Amino acid sequence: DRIDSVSQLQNVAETTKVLFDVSKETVELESEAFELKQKVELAHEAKAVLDS
Amino acid sequence: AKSAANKLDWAKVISSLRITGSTATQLSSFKKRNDEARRQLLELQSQPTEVDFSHYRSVLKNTSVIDKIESYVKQYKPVKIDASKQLQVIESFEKHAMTNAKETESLVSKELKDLQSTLDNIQSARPFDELTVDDLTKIKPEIDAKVEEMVKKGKWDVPGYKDRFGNLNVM
Amino acid sequence: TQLLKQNQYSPLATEEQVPLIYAGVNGHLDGIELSRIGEFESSFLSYLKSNHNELLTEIREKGELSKELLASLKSATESFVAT
Numbered sequence A: 001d002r003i004d005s006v007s008q009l010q011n012v013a014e015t016t017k018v019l020f021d022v023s024k025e026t027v028e029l030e031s032e033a034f035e036l037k038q039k040v041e042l043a044h045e046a047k048a049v050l051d052s
Numbered sequence B: 001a002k003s004a005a006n007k008l009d010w011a012k013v014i015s016s017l018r019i020t021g022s023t024a025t026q027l028s029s030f031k032k033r034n035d036e037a038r039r040q041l042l043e044l045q046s047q048p049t050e051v052d053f054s055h056y057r058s059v060l061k062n063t064s065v066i067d068k069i070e071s072y073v074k075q076y077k078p079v080k081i082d083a084s085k086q087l088q089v090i091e092s093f094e095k096h097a098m099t100n101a102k103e104t105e106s107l108v109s110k111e112l113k114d115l116q117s118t119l120d121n122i123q124s125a126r127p128f129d130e131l132t133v134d135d136l137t138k139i140k141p142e143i144d145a146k147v148e149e150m151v152k153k154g155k156w157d158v159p160g161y162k163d164r165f166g167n168l169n170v171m
Numbered sequence C: 001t002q003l004l005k006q007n008q009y010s011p012l013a014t015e016e017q018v019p020l021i022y023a024g025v026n027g028h029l030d031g032i033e034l035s036r037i038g039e040f041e042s043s044f045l046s047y048l049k050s051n052h053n054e055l056l057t058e059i060r061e062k063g064e065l066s067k068e069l070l071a072s073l074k075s076a077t078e079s080f081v082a083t
Helices: A002-008 A012-027 A032-051 B002-007 B009-015 B025-044 B066-075 B090-123 B133-139 B141-152 C014-022 C038-049 C053-061 C067-082
Strands: none
Touching: A002 B090, A012 B009, A012 B025, A012 B090, A032 B025, A032 B066, B002 B009, B002 B025, B009 B025, B133 B141, C014 C038, C014 C053, C014 C067, C038 C053, C038 C067, C053 C067
């Protein structure tokens, strides 16, 4: 039974490193379009005033 | 990229069968889907952030503000830079990640062969008919140790026998 | 009948009609209780628009399901069923 328990995570821990790696960027890489959000909302009011 | 980002997320859900009750890894995956889903919608609804001086300005014959507004867009055309500030703490999460994963991987790699040798040990070392109880004394002094204080403390009666072997009472 | 429900002002497209009703033949009774089959269909659509855009495309330009395309669609449906 302990053969299976050890073999459950024989391949997991090293494959979780790239998992832990990429998950960090994919979470904390949302700032570039956050600034684009600032200019996208800047565009809407620019359209809004001229439409007004 | 987008399909590649969550492609390895389908790896952790398979990794999640052995690890049940993940407090924040799924939340972090949820967070990395929550913001990412906000990304595609943001860029698809993103018009070219400009006022059409050709059409959208010439529709107004009383312009008087569009050039100011067009300049106002251009003066703030460099809205704000990205924030790639995380270059010392983000890897500090990773440096713990290298430390514990290799600690785990070194142990499991050692134990899988060590426990496999135990299986090879037991299959060809089974003296179920020729083992010595004195050899059991040798293999564990606890077997030797547990018998002396048994008599001194007064636990003369020993249960746990009739369950396996009958008492073998004569008729 | 709970699956065919839709909301106004939300038109849909054939390339994502096909997966939802195809799931209605190979695994629909295992849906996660009736009040939560709607986000089941939405999450199925998400799981096919992400990481599975090839299926949606192939079925949207050619307009039909080839044998290998049927196999891939069945595989995706059962994969999200196990999910």
